[PDB]
Design a protein around this ligand. Structure first.
Ligand SMILES: Nc1nc2c(ncn2[C@@H]2O[C@H](COP(=O)(O)OP(=O)(O)NP(=O)(O)O)[C@@H](O)[C@H]2O)c(=O)[nH]1
Ligand SMILES: [Mg+2]
Lengths: 171, 476
C-alpha cells in the first residue's frame, strides 16, 4: 500500500465503461451488464515502480439526470479517462460537452485518455481510428488508444500507460 | 473430521464465552482464524459448521488487531460474507452473526472503502434488512449500527441506492425502544439528510425524532443524536417548520429540546446539539422567541457557558442561540446590564476563532433615573473593556467581512458614551477603522458604516499634522 489513485472514467450511456471497468479489475465480461445508477468504486492495488499502488476507479453514469451527482469527484480526480463508442458518432460528438464537464471541474494534473470501445468490428465503425487522433488536437495531456472490453484488448495499457504517466507526472 | 470438527467448534462456542482464555487462544501458534476459515472452506452447506463457526468469529473479532483486521479483507471477509449470506439467505442466526462480524471488522477506515467497493458491496445489508428480518429486533439493531459505521465520505453511494435512505427510516419507526438502534439510526440519518434532500418523505424523520426525544429521556446519547437529526432535518426542509408547535395537531418539540438542554447539563456535546437545535427552531419562528425568553432560558444558557468555559464549540452555540433568541426583542436595561460582561468573558476566553466571534458579534448588537442606569451600565461596560475586545478582533481578522461590518456598528453605537473619546483614546481605535476602510473600499455597506466612524474618531491627536495624509487620501 504505497499510494491510492483517483482515476475517473466518464463517457456516454451504454458505451461500456462499466464493461471496461471490471475487465481490468475483476476480469469479467457480460453482455447483459446493467448500466450504473450513479458513481461506484472498484478497488485495486497494483505494485509497480517499486510501489504497491492502490487504485480507485469511479465509474460514473453518463445519463442527464446523473450529471450533477458525479460532478463532486472531478475536483478530486487524479487521472481522467474518457470512453466513447464506435457505432455512435453521437457518443463521440459530445466530447467537448464532456470536456465542458471536464474543464469546469478538472484539476491541473488531469491526464486525459480517449478510448474507442468495442474494436471488434471497426470496419462498421461510424468513427475512424484516425478521427480520434484527429480529435487528439487538444492539449498535451490528451492521448488515444482504441480497444475492446469484449476482446479484452489492451485494457491494461489503458490504465497502466495512464498510471505510469501519472506516476511519471508524480515526482 | 466432518463429524469431529463440528463438536470441536461446539466446544469452542461454549468455551469462548468465558473470556480471558481468548487471549491465550490468540497467543498460540495455531492461527486459529485460519483454522476456522480452513474449516468453513472445508465444510460448506452445513448449518452447524456454518452457524457455530460464525458465532465464534462474532466474539473473536473483538480483539485481534487493527492491521490483521485491515489485512483480513484480502480474501477472508470473502469467505464469511459469501458463504453465509449467499449460502444461507434464510438462516436467521447466520445472517445475524454475519452482520455482526462484518460490523466488527468495519472499524478501520482502510476497510470501509473495501466494504463499499464494487466487488465487495455492503448492500447485502439491505437484502438482509428486507428479507431475512422484517420482524427481528437483533438483526435490525446490528444492521443499522453497521450502516452508521459505513458513513464515511462516500455518502452518494449509500443515499443514491434508495434502498438505504428509506429502509433505515422504516427501521426507526418499527422499534422505538432499542436505544442502540436510535443512536445509530439518527446519527446515520443526520449524516445523510443533506444528500437525500438534494434529490411526504420529510414527515418521516420528524415523528420518530419527536417520540425519541420524549421516550428515551434519561439517556444522553439518544438525545444528542435526536437533537442532531432534528436540526439537520429542519435546516434542509423548511416546509415542515409549520408541522411542529405547542398548538394542537403539532409537536411541541421546542419544549422537549429545552428540557433536554436542561437535563444533561454536565455534557457539552448534548448542549451543543440542543443549542443548534433551538437555534434552527427560532430561526423561522417568531412566537418561539418570546416563550423561552419568558421561560428564562437565557440565564440558563449563560450558566452553561459559565460551566463549559474552556470549550469553544458550546460558546459558539450559546452565542448563536442568543442571536436567534433576541432577534427582535425589546429589553429592559437590567437585562443587558447583567448579560454583557458574561459574553465578553465568553469572547476573551475563546479569543481565537472567527465563528465564535461571528455569532457573538451578531448577538451582542441586539442590546445596543434611567439615564443614571445607562451611565453606570456603559461605565461598567467599558470596565469590561468592550472596545479592546472588538477592535483587536477586527485587528485579528482582516478577513471575515461580516464582523468587519457588525463590530463597526457596535463601536459606532458605543461611541455615544462619555468614556469613548476618553477610552477609545485610552486604547486607540481609529487606525483599525482606517486599515479596514482600505481593506474594504468597495463594499458600500462597510464603507458607509465605517465612514461615520471615521467622522466620530478624529480628534486633534489623530488629525495632528502628517497623520492626516492617509485620512485625506482615503476620504477622497
Ligand atoms: N461488442 C462489445 N460490446 C461492448 C463492449 N463494451 C461494452 N459493450 C456493450 O455495451 C453495453 C453497455 O454496458 P455498460 O458497461 O453499462 O456501458 P456504460 O456506458 O458504461 N453504461 P453505465 O456507465 O451507465 O454503467 C454492454 O452491456 C455491452 O453489451 C465491447 O468491448 N465490445
Ligand atoms: Mg456501464
Amino acid at each position: 500500500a504505497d499510494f491510492k489513485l483517483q482515476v475517473i472514467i466518464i463517457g456516454s450511456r451504454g458505451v461500456g465503461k462499466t464493461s471496461l471497468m471490471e475487465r481490468f479489475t475483476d476480469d469479467t465480461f457480460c453482455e447483459a451488464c446493467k448500466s450504473t445508477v450513479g458513481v461506484d468504486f472498484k478497488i485495486k492495488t497494483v505494485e509497480l515502480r517499486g510501489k504497491k499502488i492502490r487504485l480507485q476507479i469511479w465509474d460514473t453514469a453518463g445519463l442527464e439526470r446523473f450529471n450533477s451527482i458525479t460532478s463532486a469527484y472531478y475536483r478530486s480526480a487524479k487521472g481522467i479517462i474518457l470512453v466513447y463508442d464506435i457505432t455512435k458518432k453521437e457518443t463521440f460528438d459530445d466530447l467537448p460537452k464532456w470536456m465542458k464537464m471536464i474543464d469546469k471541474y478538472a484539476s491541473e494534473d488531469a491526464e486525459l485518455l480517449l478510448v474507442g470501445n468495442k474494436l471488434d468490428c471497426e470496419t462498421d465503425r461510424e468513427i475512424t481510428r484516425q478521427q480520434g487522433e484527429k480529435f487528439a488536437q487538444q492539449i498535451t495531456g490528451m492521448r488515444f488508444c482504441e480497444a475492446s472490453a469484449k476482446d479484452n484488448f489492451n485494457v491494461d495499457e489503458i490504465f497502466l500507460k495512464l498510471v505510469d504517466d501519472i506516476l511519471k507526472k508524480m515526482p | 473430521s466432518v463429524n469431529l470438527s463440528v463438536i470441536g467448534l461446539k466446544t469452542l462456542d461454549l468455551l469462548l464465552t468465558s473470556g480471558k482464555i481468548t487471549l491465550l487462544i490468540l497467543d498460540e501458534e495455531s492461527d486459529i482464524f485460519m483454522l476456522i476459515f480452513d474449516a468453513m472452506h472445508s465444510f460448506p452447506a452445513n448449518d452447524e459448521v456454518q452457524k457455530l463457526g460464525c458465532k465464534a468469529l462474532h466474539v473473536l473479532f473483538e480483539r485481534v488487531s487493527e492491521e490483521q483486521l485491515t489485512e483480513f479483507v484480502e480474501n477472508k471477509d470473502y469467505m464469511i460474507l459469501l458463504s453465509a449470506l449467499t449460502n444461507f439467505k434464510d438462516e436467521e442466526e447466520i445472517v445475524l452473526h454475519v452482520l455482526h462480524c462484518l460490523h466488527s471488522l468495519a472499524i478501520p477506515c482502510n476497510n470501509v472503502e473495501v466494504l463499499m467497493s464494487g466487488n465487495v458491496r455492503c448492500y447485502n445489508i439491505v437484502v438482509e434488512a428486507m428479507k431475512a428480518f422484517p420482524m427481528s429486533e437483533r438483526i435490525q439493531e446490528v444492521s443499522c449500527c453497521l450502516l452508521h459505521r459505513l458513513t464515511l465520505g462516500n455518502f452518494f453511494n449509500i443515499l443514491v441506492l434508495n434502498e438505504v435512505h428509506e429502509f433505515v427510516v422504516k427501521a426507526v419507526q418499527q422499534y422505538p425502544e432499542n436505544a442502540a438502534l436510535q443512536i445509530s439510526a439518527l446519527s446515520c440519518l443526520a449524516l445523510l439528510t443533506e444528500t437525500i434532500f438534494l434529490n411526504e418523505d420529510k414527515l418521516f424523520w420528524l415523528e420518530a425524532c419527536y417520540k425519541a426525544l420524549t421516550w428515551h429521556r434519561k439517556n444522553k446519547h439518544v438525545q444528542e443524536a435526536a437533537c442532531w437529526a432534528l436540526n439537520n432535518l429542519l435546516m434542509y426542509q423548511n416546509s415542515l417548520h409549520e408541522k411542529i408547535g405547542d398548538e394542537d395537531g403539532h409537536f411541541p418539540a421546542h419544549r422537549e429540546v429545552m428540557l433536554s438542554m436542561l437535563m444533561h447539563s454536565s455534557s457539552k456535546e448534548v448542549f451543543q446539539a440542543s443549542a443548534n437545535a433551538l437555534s434552527t427552531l427560532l430561526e423561522q419562528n417568531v412566537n418561539f422567541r418570546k416563550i423561552l425568553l419568558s421561560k428564562g432560558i437565557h440565564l440558563n444558557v449563560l450558566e452553561l457557558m459559565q460551566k463549559h468555559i474552556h470549550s469553544p464549540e458550546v460558546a459558539e452555540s450559546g452565542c448563536k442561540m442568543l442571536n436567534h433568541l433576541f432577534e427582535g426583542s425589546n429589553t429592559s436595561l437590567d437585562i443587558m446590564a447583567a448579560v454583557v460582561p458574561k459574553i465578553l468573558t465568553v469572547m476573551k476566553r475563546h479569543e481565537t476563532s472567527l465563528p465564535v466571534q461571528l455569532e457573538a458579534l451578531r448577538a451582542i448588537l441586539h442590546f445596543i433615573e434611567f439615564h443614571h442606569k445607562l451611565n453606570m451600565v456603559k461605565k461598567q461596560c467599558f470596565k469590561n473593556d468592550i472596545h479592546k475586545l472588538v477592535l483587536a478582533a477586527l485587528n485579528r481578522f482582516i478577513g471575515n467581512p461580516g464582523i468587519q461590518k457588525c463590530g463597526l456598528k457596535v463601536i459606532s453605537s458605543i461611541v455615544h458614551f462619555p468614556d469613548a473619546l476618553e477610552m477609545l483614546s485610552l486604547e486607540g481605535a481609529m487606525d483599525s477603522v482606517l486599515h479596514t476602510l482600505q481593506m474594504y473600499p468597495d463594499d458600500q455597506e462597510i464603507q458607509c458604516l465605517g465612514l461615520s466612524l471615521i467622522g466620530y474618531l478624529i480628534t486633534k491627536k489623530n488629525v495632528f499634522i502628517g497623520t492626516g495624509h492617509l485620512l485625506a487620501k482615503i476620504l477622497v
